[PDB]
């Protein structure tokens, strides 16, 4: 169980260890060491998703570890509340960035091992704090240098906490 | 909370009561009594929006109540997933028809109290079922008498359910 703290509220997240082992452990590694602390949601698209994890305030991309394999073939879909890994055009390019689907974005689902088919790997799900997500996805956005859809008011992830057992079964 | 039941799937929608009171109450009235049951999505334009609420299968326009005022000055935007009221050239002409934006349609936003400025009033937003929306926007459309972009195969809203008690 992971819980981050933003200026808009608290969000609790349950990881899918059995469905995306390489994805979750690489994700959990950044959480325990503090890579996600003092990061922002640098890309917020209402009606789509909110994305962060790789930028400090001021839009400087942090240094990430080696990429992971794409485990999107686990059958999980990019429904509302699920978390999936952000990546480049290369399918096995996911590093530290991820996003939360605010609606059902089924076109992002794994439909082959190709360009528009590899999809985006779901590895976690919001259990408590979707109300906080719905307030973040509605903020005002604009251009910030070479990046687009950057919120005017920074949504800063202040701290990340990792726990053990839980009542979300 | 409102839920549509179509032949393509269910769509769950959250209303913005504080931002569009006259719009939501008018809208919810048709939902509770059943005005929207057995209606269709009579206008589907891929990459734009899907629209319904005023036509039964066969393009028979149902009888509507008095028009409502336009509450588009509420600050809400016509981003993807949002619902807005359809209207004629007159700003206070919305009755029963509405549409779902499938992309960001910023040109529909309220940018003044004039002809090309009144915009379109957002009153709701899709929470679960955008996949059903994204499937509806892809159907084949054609002309049906004095109407354009009418789907060949009817997208029928079979039933509408209203949820007024608590919700997540």
From Swiss-Prot, chain B:
It is found in: Cytoplasm. The keyword Isomerase applies. Its EC number is 5.2.1.8. The keyword Phosphoprotein does not apply. Pfam families: Pro_isomerase (PF00160). Residues 1-162 form the PPIase cyclophilin-type domain. One of its GO terms (molecular function) is peptidyl-prolyl cis-trans isomerase activity. Inhibition by cyclosporin A with a Ki of 25 to 50 mu-mol, a concentration 1000-fold higher than that required for eukaryotic PPIases. Keywords: Cytoplasm, Isomerase, Rotamase. One of its GO terms (cellular component) is cytosol. GO terms for biological process: chaperone-mediated protein folding. InterPro entries: Cyclophilin-like_dom_sf (IPR029000), Cyclophilin-type_PPIase (IPR024936), Cyclophilin-type_PPIase_CS (IPR020892), Cyclophilin-type_PPIase_dom (IPR002130), E_coli_cyclophilin_A-like (IPR044665). It catalyses: [protein]-peptidylproline (omega=180) = [protein]-peptidylproline (omega=0). Belongs to the cyclophilin-type PPIase family. PPIases accelerate the folding of proteins. It catalyzes the cis-trans isomerization of proline imidic peptide bonds in oligopeptides. This is Peptidyl-prolyl cis-trans isomerase B. It comes from Escherichia coli (strain K12). The lineage of its organism: Bacteria, Pseudomonadati, Pseudomonadota, Gammaproteobacteria, Enterobacterales. The gene is ppiB.
């Amino acid at each position: 169980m992971v819980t981050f703290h933003t200026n808009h509220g608290d969000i609790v997240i349950k990881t899918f260890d059995d469905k995306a082992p390489e994805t979750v452990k690489n994700x959990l590694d950044y959480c325990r060491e503090g890579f996600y602390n003092n990061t922002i949601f640098h890309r917020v698209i209402n009606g789509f998703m909110i994305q962060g994890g790789g930028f400090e305030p001021g839009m400087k991309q942090k240094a990430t570890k080696e990429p992971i394999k794409n485990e999107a073939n686990n059958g999980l879909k990019n429904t509302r509340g699920t978390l999936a890994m952000a990546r480049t055009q290369a399918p096995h390019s996911a590093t530290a960035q991820x996003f939360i689907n605010v609606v059902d974005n089924d076109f992002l689902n794994f439909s082959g091992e190709s360009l528009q088919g590899w999809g985006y790997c779901v590895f976690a799900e919001v259990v408590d704090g979707m109300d906080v997500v719905d307030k973040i996805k509605g903020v005002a956005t604009g251009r910030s240098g070479m990046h687009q859809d950057v919120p005017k008011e920074d949504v800063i992830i202040e701290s990340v906490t990792v726990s053990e057992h839980h009542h979300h079964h």
